Design a protein around this motif. Sequence first.
Motif, PDB file in Angstrom:
ATOM      1  N   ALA A 156       0.831  -1.196   0.000  1.00 16.41           N
ATOM      2  CA  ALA A 156       0.000   0.000   0.000  1.00 16.41           C
ATOM      3  C   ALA A 156       0.870   1.252   0.000  1.00 16.41           C
ATOM      4  CB  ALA A 156      -0.931  -0.005   1.196  1.00 16.41           C
ATOM      5  N   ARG A 157       0.255   2.406   0.265  1.00 10.47           N
ATOM      6  CA  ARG A 157       0.984   3.669   0.190  1.00 10.47           C
ATOM      7  C   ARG A 157       2.063   3.763   1.260  1.00 10.47           C
ATOM      8  NH1 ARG A 157       1.837   8.620  -1.126  1.00 10.47           N
ATOM      9  NH2 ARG A 157       1.828  10.354   0.369  1.00 10.47           N
ATOM     10  N   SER A 158       1.768   3.319   2.478  1.00 17.96           N
ATOM     11  CA  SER A 158       2.749   3.401   3.550  1.00 17.96           C
ATOM     12  C   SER A 158       4.028   2.677   3.155  1.00 17.96           C
ATOM     13  CB  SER A 158       2.179   2.801   4.834  1.00 17.96           C
ATOM     14  OG  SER A 158       1.991   1.404   4.700  1.00 17.96           O
ATOM     15  N   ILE A 159       5.169   3.300   3.455  1.00 17.44           N
ATOM     16  CA  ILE A 159       6.452   2.724   3.062  1.00 17.44           C
ATOM     17  C   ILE A 159       6.659   1.378   3.743  1.00 17.44           C
ATOM     18  CG2 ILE A 159       8.945   3.088   3.033  1.00 17.44           C
ATOM     19  CD1 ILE A 159       7.332   4.885   1.113  1.00 17.44           C
ATOM     20  N   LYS A 160       6.251   1.265   5.009  1.00 19.56           N
ATOM     21  CA  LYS A 160       6.459   0.022   5.743  1.00 19.56           C
ATOM     22  C   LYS A 160       5.828  -1.164   5.026  1.00 19.56           C
ATOM     23  CE  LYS A 160       4.526   1.714   9.407  1.00 19.56           C
ATOM     24  NZ  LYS A 160       4.002   1.820  10.795  1.00 19.56           N
ATOM     25  N   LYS A 161       4.785  -0.925   4.240  1.00 20.91           N
ATOM     26  CA  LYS A 161       4.234  -1.928   3.343  1.00 20.91           C
ATOM     27  C   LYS A 161       4.792  -1.707   1.945  1.00 20.91           C
ATOM     28  CE  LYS A 161       0.063  -0.883   4.748  1.00 20.91           C
ATOM     29  NZ  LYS A 161      -1.420  -0.784   4.797  1.00 20.91           N
ATOM     30  N   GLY A 162       5.170  -2.796   1.284  1.00 21.20           N
ATOM     31  CA  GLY A 162       5.751  -2.710  -0.033  1.00 21.20           C
ATOM     32  C   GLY A 162       4.752  -2.179  -1.040  1.00 21.20           C
ATOM     33  N   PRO A 163       5.238  -1.575  -2.123  1.00 22.97           N
ATOM     34  CA  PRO A 163       4.319  -1.078  -3.153  1.00 22.97           C
ATOM     35  C   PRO A 163       3.381  -2.181  -3.616  1.00 22.97           C
ATOM     36  CG  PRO A 163       6.542  -0.323  -3.591  1.00 22.97           C
ATOM     37  CD  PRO A 163       6.645  -1.308  -2.467  1.00 22.97           C
ATOM     38  N   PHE A 164       2.094  -1.862  -3.690  1.00 14.24           N
ATOM     39  CA  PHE A 164       1.112  -2.887  -4.001  1.00 14.24           C
ATOM     40  C   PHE A 164       1.151  -3.255  -5.477  1.00 14.24           C
ATOM     41  CE2 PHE A 164      -3.040  -4.428  -5.315  1.00 14.24           C
ATOM     42  CZ  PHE A 164      -3.242  -5.443  -4.407  1.00 14.24           C
ATOM     43  N   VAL A 165       0.884  -4.530  -5.743  1.00 16.95           N
ATOM     44  CA  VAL A 165       0.747  -5.039  -7.099  1.00 16.95           C
ATOM     45  C   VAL A 165       0.066  -6.394  -7.005  1.00 16.95           C
ATOM     46  CG1 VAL A 165       3.118  -5.882  -6.951  1.00 16.95           C
ATOM     47  CG2 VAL A 165       1.979  -5.785  -9.175  1.00 16.95           C
TER      48      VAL A 165
END
Lengths: 113, 176, 80, 60, 77
Positions: free
Chosen positions: C1-10
């Motif tokens: 998701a948008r938060s950096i701590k979560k990887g870019p969504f795909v």
Amino acid sequence: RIAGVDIPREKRVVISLTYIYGIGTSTAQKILEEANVSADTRVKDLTDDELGRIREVVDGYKVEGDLRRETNLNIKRLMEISSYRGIRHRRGLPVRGQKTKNNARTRKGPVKT
Amino acid sequence: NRLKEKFNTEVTENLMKKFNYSSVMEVPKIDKIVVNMGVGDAVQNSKVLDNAVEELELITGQKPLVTKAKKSIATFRLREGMPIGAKVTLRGERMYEFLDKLISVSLPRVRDFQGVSKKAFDGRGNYTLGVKEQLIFPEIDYDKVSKVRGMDIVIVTTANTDEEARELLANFGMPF
Amino acid sequence: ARSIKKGPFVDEHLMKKVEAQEGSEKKQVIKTWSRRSTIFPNFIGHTFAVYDGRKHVPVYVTEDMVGHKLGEFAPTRTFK
Amino acid sequence: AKTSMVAKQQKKQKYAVREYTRCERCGRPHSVYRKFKLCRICFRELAYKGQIPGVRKASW
Amino acid sequence: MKQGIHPEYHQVIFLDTTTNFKFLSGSTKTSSEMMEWEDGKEYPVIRLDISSDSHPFYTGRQKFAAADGRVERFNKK
RNA sequence: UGGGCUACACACGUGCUACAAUGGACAAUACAAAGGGCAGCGAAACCGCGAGGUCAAGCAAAUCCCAUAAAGUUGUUCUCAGUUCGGAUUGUAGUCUGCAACUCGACUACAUGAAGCUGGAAUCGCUAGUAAUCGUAGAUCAGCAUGCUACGGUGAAUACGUUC
Ligand SMILES: [Zn+2]
């Protein structure tokens, strides 16, 4: 005169430094604290060493024409890639998902009845 | 003259061995390069044509010849003698410099580039390449480009056959 | 998701379809409804037929398009 | 509300954010209170019938 | 050639920075920077992002992303 | 599954923010009422300038939390300037919810700093704890309120008369 731009002579240094493109209130305060200078002292009543230190701190903040060129390059890149934001920049409409049925004057110019 | 030296040294020998020429005088060579831009909209705005001529001059290095209508056409609203195109002829060192530049610096700058047409031969050993964006060429800054328009590059060669023109252009480095 | 701590969504399906046939240079067009998928560097040079609501608009991925969503290049509304 | 829609609301959602509340008496999707699981209309009707413990008309 | 009609023309070294590959040829780009060349004379240099020895279609290999690029910042994220 | 309902040469209603000195900024320090809380209210501590993150006490409620109210008061500064007003606009970089913030969320840091200098014809609310200003809470609700519904703080002016 800092960064190639004149600043009001009779204005306090902290406020007068905001007249530099890329310099606002927070960055002005931070620069003034890094280059030790009285907050309330007007630029006219200022010392050459203080002015030199202020220039030294300012030169590396990447302000004025360089900032303008970087912003323009970003806008041109998003226009060129054919992004949605680029299309809206080309059409002069709000880019950040506003509603254009009303209240879009600052992007659409004056009212054309 | 790196491309000219390549042609004199390697391409000459390769082509001669490939096509079994009894004399070196039969080895095809690139006679000229004609860069043409047809500006029909000069009818409505000559300034378009002026910018196009300026861009062509920057690309090529020599002032272009302004080509005028051979005949009047009602549908195009075109009168005989109205300047509606520009053309540049390149020969010798300038030709070779432009050719190597087009092959190496310019052509790869085409978005989603996948080579140039291998069938775009007139049938007699001359090759016409239709570029579609002047921005391909490194000498033009997109800031100053008021409109994007294409060009036609005609490589006129002394080759008698499309086979020999293809061989010469491939040896030179033309993608296909 | 948008938060950096979560990887870019795909979407996993989209990513695996892109990864498939990576070695072969005859890369084809990938049909996708995932307007929300982020564009990774792995996507550079690919063609995605992105569904915009009624038809799949072809989108060619370049380096400057890295970090954006596939939906940003398939407009949904038509005006003039 | 539509019977198919009520059924689709009752059934489990593959998402979890995809869960929404419907009035359990009539099926109205809008204006449903959580404490009663009723829309405003059913809440008013049942309060008039006196069948909602402790709920009466208010005034002050 | 005629005098005073053609644009100024001079030698330049196009440099594909991706592969740091230098090619000498005439043009009118006239970059300030100057670099030495194998012939004793120096000529200016024209920076180039992508060239024949670096474009994937010419090379047959995947192109390499440059520093400070979108891909580099995305991988740093 | 994806996209409309969020479009945008335009016209209208209802509001929020302002155009400043009865003010802006900075630091210190008081005074409310009414509601909500179970997988919900998240105290203190540590980290980040920041929105927030880690650990985590108490609490199914007159006990714990949401939750330090703001206007105000006292000191310094600006001195009547499109400004130290005003915060739309957009660049970059973050936080949070959600499988997912492109179309199309809110908020936060830095920069950018538009119109606007009390508004023509006309037109609206209100008779007292009322109007006006200041915040506070809740239903819906993962997230999203300038709307709606309630709460209190400060707290006016005028009503001669029935010609229209
Ligand atoms: Zn109901």
